[PDB]
């Protein structure tokens, strides 16, 4: 339906033949889905195409046409030289392309953790159905409420709220939320802003609740049209890698041409320059990495996958780089540090008042879940709530001032919350108390859940509800006695500090007594005792207005005037609630200290209790002075800007803050260059999660909050954040592990060849051999390092700085130190076969350099064979050393600094596998006879393998010297 806005609700409903009260039949849904397709943009549909991608590189094509002009000149080992090079490079492509496509798929599949959802009413179920937006069809009834992301193009049928505010910004630009209505917008031309009866796919619900019919899905929606005409930013680390990418690439390209020029008049020996060119371009293919290395994205994909399987769904990828550098975590308390498993465990009422004297009737409630299964005790001895007249009224207030209920889940077997956590915990208390002595012992678990509550409800009619407001911090309900004349009453619950002041009397049993200063102070005595004690209880004071104003003397829709209607109150009692810190939080807090990350708790608790919980969880010490390190939103607002900013530098605890305080806190933190992870879940936290470095949204939270954040905690657990920061740090190490191994080995390949040229020695490795090691190393041990376990002490050092360079000075030295020795160890093995080996030696003086003058200049200073220089045995020492030293160097990259005696070779059980699998392929080109002709003949079974190993192995020892320097320096 294309003109839905201009036409009536009735016209739209009629067009799709859908019942507003019912929604589409499973059949309609089916046919409509056929007709209109899934509510999504199409997936733009690699393999063979991705292989030929690699041959588009000009340096790879230069080599192939230098191996063809070498073949065609020969035709009119070197017979099938272009045959092998092509076969290796098509395999070298697939090795590093299939690795890339796999990594990208695994990163793409992260989206399955957070699928786009929607809420439809359908014919098959009476209740609202929460299906994937993907499956939403033009025609069906949708429900949207505060915090929702509008799933498709919707014509509003009815606004169930008093007002519906929509955040259209994503589509129109109007950053102020638009008001909405049901009436038809008669102009068929009218632009989106004028379409005030329409909900646009991709937009948010800033407040209220609407019911509507889907007009257009897929590419037919307004934002779907945009995303077809829609046709960009590099993370700090990418810029420092690409920069180093050129740095490395342009050094090797200079040495590559310098190898061609060092061989001056050597073009004559057997026009002749084409050999020294293809041996200098094969280095340009082997030592220069064009396009981001495949193992980099492989270990990022694997990292984020681990994170999701830990409940940390990464929404924004670059936030994995930001995650290493985080220095501050702003966690909310009630959902995230504490379980939100709430239960009233203590309560008091007034006992005896005599002038300045005031005593209390304290009670404790056993049973800490939501089940109506426990005892009310007084002095550790069980008592019957019903005997105390105050407890009756306390229980009446808790029953009526309640928008929740309980629900016995039959299949799970346990009693379950319906309303809010705080209120269910009040329902549960009214159940345990049973102030009216109702027969409940014969009730079924299901019928039991609300029995005692529903008795009180049959005692007075709930007329209306004065809803909670942050200013007064309390809510109330107006009530008239059911049937039959005790006058109407109001029941108030809220913060103790707030409501106790609004009390003019106190209830003692069924007696009313004038509220004095000694009684007021006595009440708060225990209130403080409880919130500061072993269990940091969240107290509520429960009060009644005995004489409420006339039902028509109160404005029932204006929030601000409510507190006025909640005065002349009578204090009745207090319920102390328990909501315990999550067990891992204690230790995750400790980790953050060691990590060097500051943790700031934001709470709804009053300051005193707020501080106490911080002491409990370890944010503070049990004795620690805190006066200038914890603030309420009110206190914080009375500090001058500069002191506010200063306060943010040291504060670990913020109690009772405005929604606008989180953005302020982030901002101030930022002026000190802190990298801050903020938690949020409401429409209100959206701007603040945008401002923070790592916006962390709650899974249970609103779509809006998630859409505006980098990461969503699936399990709302604070520890999930700490785990995520570790997985962030663990990733960055695993990058530099593979980065060291790739960069040092390529420096090895450059040092290997530039020694052969700049000294004068015979060819160390042929182009067919160089491209072989460069395929086996990049194919097995390199791709195995993407699987080595998270490094050892990652969480014990301070957080990485975002201004730091990718590769430091010291690290560039380790890349050279190793890169040098590996290059020298291969050229010092082929040269060893002549000089000091027992298979036809060159002169230990220094004659091997001048191999050029032998075939013609034999009679001068030689006296030996002049064809055993191209021998098939020095080159099989240079290859065998290179492979083995690369397998040896791969063990150096299981940790950046930690020695092999603390992190053994079997830490990565898979790298050891790729060593054996690389050794099987290396031994196959030495023994299986069709091949070693095109390569070279085997190394002497036992004597020369001991030399290869005593040449290669010291590279492990060399790094251990560098690692000992490294570990014993920090």
């Amino acid at each position: 339906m294309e003109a839905a806005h201009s036409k009536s609700t009735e016209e739209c409903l009629a067009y799709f033949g859908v019942s507003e009260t019912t929604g589409l039949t499973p059949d309609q849904v089916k046919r409509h889905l056929e007709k209109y397709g899934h509510n999504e943009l199409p997936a733009e549909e690699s393999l063979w195409e991705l292989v030929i991608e690699q041959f588009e590189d000009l340096l790879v094509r230069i080599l192939l046409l230098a191996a063809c002009i070498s073949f065609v000149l020969a035709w009119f080992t070197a017979f099938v030289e272009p045959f092998v090079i092509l076969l290796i490079l098509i395999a070298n492509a697939i090795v590093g392309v299939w690795q890339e496509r796999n990594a990208e798929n695994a990163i793409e599949a992260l989206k399955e953790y957070e699928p786009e959802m929607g809420k439809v009413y359908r014919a098959d179920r009476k209740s609202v159905q929460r299906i994937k937006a993907r499956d939403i069809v033009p025609g069906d009834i949708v429900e949207v409420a505060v915090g929702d992301k509008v799933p498709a193009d919707i014509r509003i049928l009815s606004i169930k709220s008093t007002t519906l505010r929509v955040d259209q910004s994503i589509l129109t630009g109007e950053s102020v939320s638009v008001i909405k209505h049901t009436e038809p917008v008669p102009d068929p031309r009218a632009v989106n802003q004028d379409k005030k009866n329409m909900l646009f796919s991709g937009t948010n619900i800033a407040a209220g609740k609407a019911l509507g019919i889907v007009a257009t899905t897929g590419v037919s929606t307004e934002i779907g049209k945009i995303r077809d005409q829609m046709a960009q930013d590099k993370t700090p680390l990418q810029q420092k890698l690409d920069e180093f990418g050129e740095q490395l690439s342009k050094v090797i390209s200079l040495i590559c041409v310098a190898v061609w020029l060092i061989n001056i008049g050597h073009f004559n020996d057997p026009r002749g320059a084409i050999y020294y060119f293809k041996i200098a371009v094969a280095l340009a293919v082997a030592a220069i990495p064009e396009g981001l290395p495949a193992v980099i994205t492989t270990c990022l994909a694997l990292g984020t996958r681990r994170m999701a399987k830990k409940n940390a769904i990464v929404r924004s990828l670059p936030s994995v780089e930001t995650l290493g550098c985080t220095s501050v975590i702003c966690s909310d308390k009630t959902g995230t540090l504490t379980t939100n498993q709430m239960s009233v465990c203590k309560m008091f009422i007034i006992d005896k008042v005599d002038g300045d004297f005031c005593s209390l009737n304290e009670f404790s409630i056993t049973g800490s879940t939501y089940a109506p299964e426990g005892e009310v005790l007084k002095n550790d001895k069980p008592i019957r709530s019903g005997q105390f007249d105050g407890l009756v009224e306390l229980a009446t207030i808790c029953a009526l001032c309640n928008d929740s209920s309980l629900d016995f889940n039959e299949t799970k077997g346990v009693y379950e919350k319906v309303g809010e956590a705080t209120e269910t915990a009040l329902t549960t208390l009214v159940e345990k108390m049973n102030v009216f002595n109702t027969e409940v012992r014969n009730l079924s678990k299901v019928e039991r859940a609300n029995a005692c509550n529903s008795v009180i409800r049959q005692l007075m009619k709930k007329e209306f509800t004065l809803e909670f407001s942050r200013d007064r911090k309390s809510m109330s309900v107006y009530c008239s006695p059911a049937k039959s004349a005790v006058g109407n009453k109001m029941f108030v619950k809220g913060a103790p500090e707030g409501v106790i002041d609004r009390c003019n009397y106190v209830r003692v049993g069924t007696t009313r007594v004038p509220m004095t200063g000694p009684v007021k102070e006595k009440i708060l005595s225990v209130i403080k005792e409880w919130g500061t004690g072993r269990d940091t209880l969240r107290c509520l004071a429960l009060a009644t207005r005995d004489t409420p104003p006339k039902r028509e003397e109160m404005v029932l829709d204006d929030s601000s005037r409510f507190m006025e209607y909640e005065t002349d109150l009578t204090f009745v009692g207090v319920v102390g609630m328990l909501d315990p810190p999550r067990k891992e939080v204690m230790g995750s807090i400790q980790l953050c200290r060691d990590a060097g990350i500051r943790v700031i708790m934001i709470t709804g608790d009053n300051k005193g209790t707020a501080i106490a919980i911080c002491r409990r969880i370890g944010i503070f010490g049990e004795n620690e002075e805190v006066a200038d390190r914890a603030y309420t939103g009110r206190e914080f607002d009375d500090l001058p800007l500069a002191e506010q900013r200063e306060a943010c530098r040291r504060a670990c605890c913020f109690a009772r803050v405005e929604p606008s305080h989180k953005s302020k806190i982030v901002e101030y933190l930022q002026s000190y260059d802190e990298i801050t992870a903020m938690t949020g879940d409401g429409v209100n936290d959206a701007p603040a999660l945008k401002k923070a470095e790592i916006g962390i949204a709650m899974g249970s939270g609103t779509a809006v909050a998630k859409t505006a954040s980098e990461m969503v905690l699936a399990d709302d657990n604070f520890s999930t954040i700490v785990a995520a920061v570790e997985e962030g740090r663990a990733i960055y190490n695993n990058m530099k592990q593979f980065i060291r191994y790739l960069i040092s080995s390529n420096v090895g390949e450059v040092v290997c060849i530039f020694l052969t040229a700049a000294l004068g020695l015979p060819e160390a490795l042929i182009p067919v051999q160089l491209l072989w090691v460069n395929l086996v190393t990049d194919g097995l041990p390199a791709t195995a390092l993407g699987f080595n376990p998270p490094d050892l002490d990652i969480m014990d050092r301070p957080p990485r700085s975002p201004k730091e360079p990718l590769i430091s000075g010291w690290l560039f030295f380790r890349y050279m130190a190793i890169g040098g020795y590996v290059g020298a160890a291969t050229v010092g093995a082929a040269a060893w076969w002549f000089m000091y080996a027992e298979d036809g030696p060159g002169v230990t003086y220094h004659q091997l350099t001048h191999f050029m003058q032998c075939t013609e200049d034999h009679p001068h200073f030689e006296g030996l064979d002049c064809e055993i220089f191209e021998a098939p045995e020095p080159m099989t020492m240079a290859l065998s050393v290179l492979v083995t030293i690369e397998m040896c160097n791969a063990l150096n990259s299981l940790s950046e600094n930690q020695s092999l005696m603390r992190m053994p070779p079997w830490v990565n059980i898979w790298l050891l596998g790729s060593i054996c699998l690389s050794m099987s392929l290396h031994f196959l080109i030495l023994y299986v006879d069709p091949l070693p002709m095109i390569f070279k003949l085997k190394a002497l079974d036992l004597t020369q393998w001991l030399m290869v190993l005593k040449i290669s192995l010291p590279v492990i020892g060399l790094d251990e010297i560098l690692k000992f320097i490294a570990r014993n320096y920090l």
């Binding site: 098509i90 395999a91 690795q99 399987k309 194919g779 097995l780």
Partner: peptide, 30 residues
Amino acid sequence: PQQARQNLQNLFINFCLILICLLLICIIVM
């Protein structure tokens, strides 16, 4: 049996591809 499973599937495919690469140089023999 999760990351360890996506491990054999990775290495064994990289080994299998190099194995065939040789048995095309080993095949091209006359």
